[PDB]
């Protein structure tokens, strides 16, 4: 548990600077899926459709 948390915290530093605009929890899921093998291009695409879908819904 110690090792994992310490990469994430360094990982959240980059995400807020680079302007990802994702949440903490969601990022951990993105990283677990990668380590289990996912394509990056597909993964961003899914995130994007979900993101747009949430904004429209609220209004």
């Amino acid at each position: 548990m110690s090792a994992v948390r310490e990469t994430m915290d360094v990982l959240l530093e980059i995400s807020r600077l680079l302007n990802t605009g994702l949440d903490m929890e969601t990022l951990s899921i993105c990283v677990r899926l990668c380590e289990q093998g996912i394509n990056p291009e597909a993964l961003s695409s899914v995130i994007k459709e979900l993101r747009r879908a949430s904004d429209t819904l609220k209004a």
Binding site: S54, K58, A59
Partner: protein
């Protein structure tokens, strides 16, 4: 599921959009915005409906509480740390967008000063003592803030945007006459020599300001008390250098600047060197005392505590009813406080 539990026991999020949204109430005059928007959308052929962050009515007064003393606000845009302004998407349902902008722009410009005044806080001697006097008012100004915070958590809520707004008005008028003092206070950084004129002339701008407010006071004497707090704690090292210059003979100064251009002559053919600075009658008392202590520590042969006490004794009987008018009388008690020590020091000179 835990996410859903949080979402009900905490008020719904409005810094990120992923929480559903209220802006309903059963009164007829509280859905004013939905009515106002509708009007614009049919009258004006060219209307641009903004993308509005739905707020969360009368929680704008909680962001006024934080903003006026406390931390930088990352819920609203601040272009820099001396320019506070309010995002153009904040709506409260029981007013117009524009109407809303206008109350939040008054407190924004009043939180612009306390936030600017907070960047001066450094966690030489004169500046460190002016910092602890500004910082002292900030911990007593949050006492009233933490009171108004317990009012909104109490059920029923009570507060609206503008109802505790004329309650925090004495402090509001106190942080503005701080602004006039401070602009005149530090605004000597581009000026040449940072040495004695900055320190002297910020004690002198405090001195100039207490005449402008005390002698027109007695209808806001709230602002007279504040400028005198800032003076009694700013004058506190600058008098106690003069206390060490007599009862020990020599004084303490920074090793990178002077705060009074008090200098002692190491060879003996003159006593002390003077260089003019910025009150004016008190400066002559320093010359004559140092002349006499400078011989007596090389050749023996043959104040702050008192200030506070003469101030208090006027007070238990700023304005006073044992002095007229007003603050220069409590000061002229101090010119005898130096004087009772000063004449008997110079007494000892001729004795050797």
């Amino acid at each position: 599921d835990a996410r859903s539990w949080l979402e009900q026991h905490i008020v719904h999020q409005y810094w990120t959009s992923r929480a559903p949204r209220f802006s309903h109430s059963s009164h007829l005059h509280s859905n004013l915005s939905a009515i106002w928007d509708q009007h614009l959308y049919t009258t004006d052929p060219l209307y641009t409906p903004d993308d509005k962050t739905i707020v969360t009515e009368t929680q704008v007064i909680r962001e006024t509480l934080w903003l006026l003393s406390g931390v930088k606000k990352l819920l609203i845009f601040q272009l820099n740390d001396g320019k506070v302004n309010v995002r153009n998407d904040i709506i409260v349902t029981h007013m117009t967008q524009n109407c809303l902008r206008s109350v939040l722009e008054q407190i924004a410009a009043y939180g612009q000063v306390v936030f600017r005044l907070q960047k001066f806080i450094d966690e030489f001697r004169t500046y460190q003592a002016f910092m602890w006097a500004l910082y002292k008012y900030f911990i007593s100004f949050k006492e009233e803030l933490t009171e108004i915070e317990k009012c909104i958590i109490n059920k029923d809520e009570t507060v609206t945007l503008a109802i505790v707004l004329d309650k925090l008005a004495p402090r509001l008028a106190q942080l503005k006459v701080l602004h006039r003092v401070f602009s005149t206070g530090i605004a000597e950084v581009p000026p040449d020599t940072r040495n004695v004129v900055r320190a002297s002339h910020l004690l002198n701008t405090l001195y100039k300001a207490i005449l402008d407010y005390d002698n027109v006071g007695e209808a806001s004497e709230q602002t007279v008390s504040l400028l005198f707090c800032l003076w009694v704690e700013t004058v506190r090292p600058y008098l106690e250098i003069v206390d060490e210059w007599i009862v020990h003979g020599n004084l303490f100064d920074p090793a990178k600047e002077f705060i009074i251009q008090r200098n002692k002559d190491v060879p003996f053919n003159h006593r002390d060197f003077w260089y003019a600075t910025y009150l004016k009658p008190v400066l002559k008392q320093i010359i004559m005392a140092g002349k006499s202590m400078q011989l007596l520590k090389n050749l023996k042969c043959r104040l702050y505590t008192l200030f506070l006490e003469s101030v208090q004794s006027r007070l238990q009987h700023s304005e006073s009813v044992t002095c007229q008018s007003f603050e220069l009388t409590l000061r002229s008690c101090l010119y005898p406080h130096i004087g009772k020590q000063y004449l008997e020091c110079c007494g000892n000179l001729m004795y050797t």
